[PDB]
Amino acid sequence: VDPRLYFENRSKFIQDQKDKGINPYPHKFERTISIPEFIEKYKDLGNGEHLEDTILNITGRIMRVSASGQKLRFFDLVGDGEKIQVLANYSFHNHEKGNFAECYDKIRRGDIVGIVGFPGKSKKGELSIFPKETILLSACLHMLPMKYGLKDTEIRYRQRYLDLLINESSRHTFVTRTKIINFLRNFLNERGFFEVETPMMNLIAGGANARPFITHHNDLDLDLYLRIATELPLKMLIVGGIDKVYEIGKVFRNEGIDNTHNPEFTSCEFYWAYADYNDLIKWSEDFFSQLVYHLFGTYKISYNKDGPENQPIEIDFTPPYPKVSIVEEIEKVTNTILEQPFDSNETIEKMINIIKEHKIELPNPPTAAKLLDQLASHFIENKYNDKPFFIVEHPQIMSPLAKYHRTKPGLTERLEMFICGKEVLNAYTELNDPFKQKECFLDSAFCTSLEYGLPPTGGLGLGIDRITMFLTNKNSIKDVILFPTMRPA
Amino acid sequence: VDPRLYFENRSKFIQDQKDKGINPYPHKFERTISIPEFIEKYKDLGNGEHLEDTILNITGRIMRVSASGQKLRFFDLVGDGEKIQVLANYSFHNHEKGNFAECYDKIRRGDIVGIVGFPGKSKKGELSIFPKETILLSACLHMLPMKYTEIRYRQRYLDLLINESSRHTFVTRTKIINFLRNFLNERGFFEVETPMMNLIARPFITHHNDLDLDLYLRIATELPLKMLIVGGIDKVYEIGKVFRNEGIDNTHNPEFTSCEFYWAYADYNDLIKWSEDFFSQLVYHLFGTYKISYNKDGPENQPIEIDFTPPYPKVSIVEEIEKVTNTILEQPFDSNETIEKMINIIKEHKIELPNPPTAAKLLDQLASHFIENKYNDKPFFIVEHPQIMSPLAKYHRTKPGLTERLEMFICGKEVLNAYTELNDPFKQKECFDSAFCTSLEYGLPPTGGLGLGIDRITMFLTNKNSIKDVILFPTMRPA
Ligand SMILES: COC(=O)c1ccc(OC)c(Nc2ncnc(Nc3ccccc3S(=O)(=O)C(C)C)n2)c1
Ligand SMILES: COC(=O)c1ccc(OC)c(Nc2ncnc(Nc3ccccc3S(=O)(=O)C(C)C)n2)c1
Ligand SMILES: N[C@@H](CCCC[NH3+])C(=O)O
Ligand SMILES: N[C@@H](CCCC[NH3+])C(=O)O
């Protein structure tokens, strides 16, 4: 019952073994079949059918120990997410290698073993390996949580291996996460896009609005910023003639941690020459509907927005998705005209007064771009929760790198897609006129590259961790990152 | 002639066009076919053959400007690394949309243009696009050079536009990583992401504000991946950036791309076989052969042939030093006698003494000058390094003081490092990271782990002598 006592006893057991000549951590084991291959090959045997002439070397982790007398031992063996039974019968044991009871009394839950034996099914129909010999390969010195015991704690996020061993759902979640990225990489590659890597470290951190991380470069004797986005170097590659380009990799933002914000997270940003806003809308609807159907065989999924203790909701990913113009909707909802320029003193005061009258938290500093973001969050960002939708046509002052709207003054051809009130996608027609970049006349290198001619371009960015959360029914981003950022305890 | 005046003149042209009601940066051109698709579908056209009844919308970048008389204007149009010619002929100019000379007088080398026209070949046989209308999509305000050395690194877009061997170099790099991803995926490996920032060579140090604690950029992915082996991901790998805050040279960058995999129940021969399978097939997948040419000493000097036909030689580091230097290195290798011996061979050859003169560094120095260039004929492995050079590698089964470590070399440059894991916690001297020793106590199976230097591999497979030439935006000293 005392985990400390269990550990010291197991430590003494390990030393007891090796001063008896037996190496409890042997060098190699010539495994011949894996547990998933074993299940695939022998799922068809009848109950009680033994294949005694087929000798297999199989490895796994013991997860359950029981017996029926000293001459019959039963175990669960797991590997690669799959499970078989171990049925050790005294009469099938290779007695030359050692005493049968001595061999199997040592096995504890969590032990990694290598088994030489034959496949079969028991009379109870459970597929089993029937050992002639089992060898300890790596002992589990600790009492593994007793199943359904890691259910909720910080041990899952720190000792993630325990989480993957005990909780069957977690492995499926991270398998789904890799299937998302594989689908996204295949989706883009099928359409001619070219994957690249751009520096994790730059003298500026552009391409988004976020506080960066600062680190020191010893060789260059210079302070660099961890990238907050891949946007600027990617658009420079468009200038270089890589007309379809993208990058899936980590970005860093040094701000508040919560259930949808992790200091480092995975983004996909692609840039698509000679495409525009309308292509990006079509791309987003094509990708999400195809991705959801790929994983589920349907466009409708369940998501526990208000936790697992409340009824879920249905998110329907059947395209098209609704589009809402941010300034128009805010003006309609608040019955107030936001007069241009949006960053005028009057309009800033008018936006604050709306925020004051509705008791919406005033952002710091109350800049026009942030005030508009707060009004959008409070008034439109939770309009649709049964389906995803786009907030579109953001003002130029919120979109410094987006092309000016081709018919609506003061706006851009920008789109953000939201699922259950969370942004997962940001895209727009790319501003390619160097003289219209207010920051030009901010990277000197990027602004200069614009002067060599950036073709009309559409670009898009994705939040992969947030996408994985909805597609795996998780309310916290820590549950889709293998080792989330954590305080030291 | 003066670049500053050219940029000033071109900038004024953009403003002059705006005042005239023309937008020099239009929002959307509905392209109908790409340049490579265009070359594919009309390469077999007859000379002088037109197809007037097929109108096509095409985009590209003007890379050359010329004119025959004044009613025929000749251009080079490049896109996706491929080129056609623009045949602007006054007869096929749609005058309803603008003056012929007015349109084509403005076009400068580097302009991104959109073209409405038909496909055909000229009399001389050069496949051409014949515009009815040509629209400026995005203008090149500077003069594009023709030849240009450090502009390549600071303005990679110019390199990608001008050199046409830079584009091949970085297409090869992506193909290398794609092959590696698919190679591991077909073998049942599972790709994951582990943190770049931890509480852990010299590190890069950053600070999170709200948490108010320092974080360190990972130097490798070894530790979290091995923890995932404990967690039951028996075949796991990650491809991504790692950071070592040291000096820059042709084969070391502080930020570089690594692949690490860990493979439960793999033994030493499994790791050797994986390496020989991967490198031989990757080379063959790229070139249709196992033998490549590589300029070891730059393009000025002679090139050598590297044969990637498996199997590769295996060399034991200690026994090979002993044979080449004609001494014996008695164990423990960190005894005052053997260290002083190794110091004395270093002095006798006037090789640089590593600071500090620790046993592992001296052994690395001896390997570098006596072993690591044993073969430039082919890749080869330096194997079975002492335990004191590899604190995480399992002990050798039969040879005292050694491990089952393997290190693969191309032209004296390390590109691969692997070994079987020391999974017994009571033999791990670090135990007696606390997060790692704890994970060992829950049971790490016998496992093989391998790491790959993607940048160095791409260098050799694109005939490059500097890591700067395979990184799109190498980190440069600013002004
Ligand atoms: C300041 O601004 C930030 O963004 C920010 C700040 C701090 C953070 O941690 C501490 C994160 N960390 C994160 N963690 C997972 N996801 C995302 N995404 C995301 C977040 C906000 C808006 C839009 C998006 S998004 O996914 O549409 C975009 C990537 C296309 N951010 C983001
Ligand atoms: C052990 O290294 C280091 O302490 C180190 C120190 C400084 C560096 O920059 C400043 C790098 N940066 C780098 N840049 C490109 N390539 C590589 N490779 C590489 C380098 C040395 C040994 C082995 C390899 S390797 O290709 O076998 C791969 C398995 C790591 N390292 C590595
Ligand atoms: N860089 C943007 C995504 C791409 C926007 C289109 N250029 C972001 O971080 O939100
Ligand atoms: N992390 C090692 C490669 C894998 C080591 C084997 N477990 C390196 O950077 O050289």
Residue numbers in the entry:
A (entry chain A): 78 to 518, 535 to 582
B (entry chain B): 78 to 225, 230 to 281, 287 to 518, 536 to 582
Give the authors' words.
Aminoacyl-tRNA synthetases (aaRSs) catalyze the synthesis of aminoacyl-tRNAs, which are crucial building blocks for protein biosynthesis. Lysyl-tRNA synthetase (LysRS) has been validated as a promising target for antimalarial, anti-Cryptosporidium, anti-Pseudomonas aeruginosa, and anti-Mycobacterium tuberculosis therapies. The ATP-binding pocket is the most promising area for the development of LysRS inhibitors. We determined five cocrystal structures of LysRS in complex with the compounds in order to provide a basis for further optimization.
Compared to compound 36, the methoxy group in the amino meta position of compound 34 is replaced by a methoxycarbonyl group, and the substitution position of methoxy group in compound 35 is different. As a result, the ΔTm values of PfLysRS caused by compound 34 and 35 were both lower than that caused by compound 36, and the potency of compound 34 against PfLysRS was weaker than that of compound 36. To understand how these compounds are recognized by PfLysRS, we determined the cocrystal structures of PfLysRS with the compounds 34, 35, 36, and 38. Most of the interactions between the compounds and the protein were preserved compared to PfLysRS-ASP3026. The methoxy group inherited from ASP3026 in these compounds were all bound to the hydrophobic cavity formed by Arg330, Glu332, His338, Asn339, and Pro340 like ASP3026. Similarly, the carbonyl oxygen of compound 34 also formed a new H-bond with Arg330. Among these compounds, compounds 34, 36 and 38 demonstrated greater inhibitory activity on parasite growth compared to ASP3026.
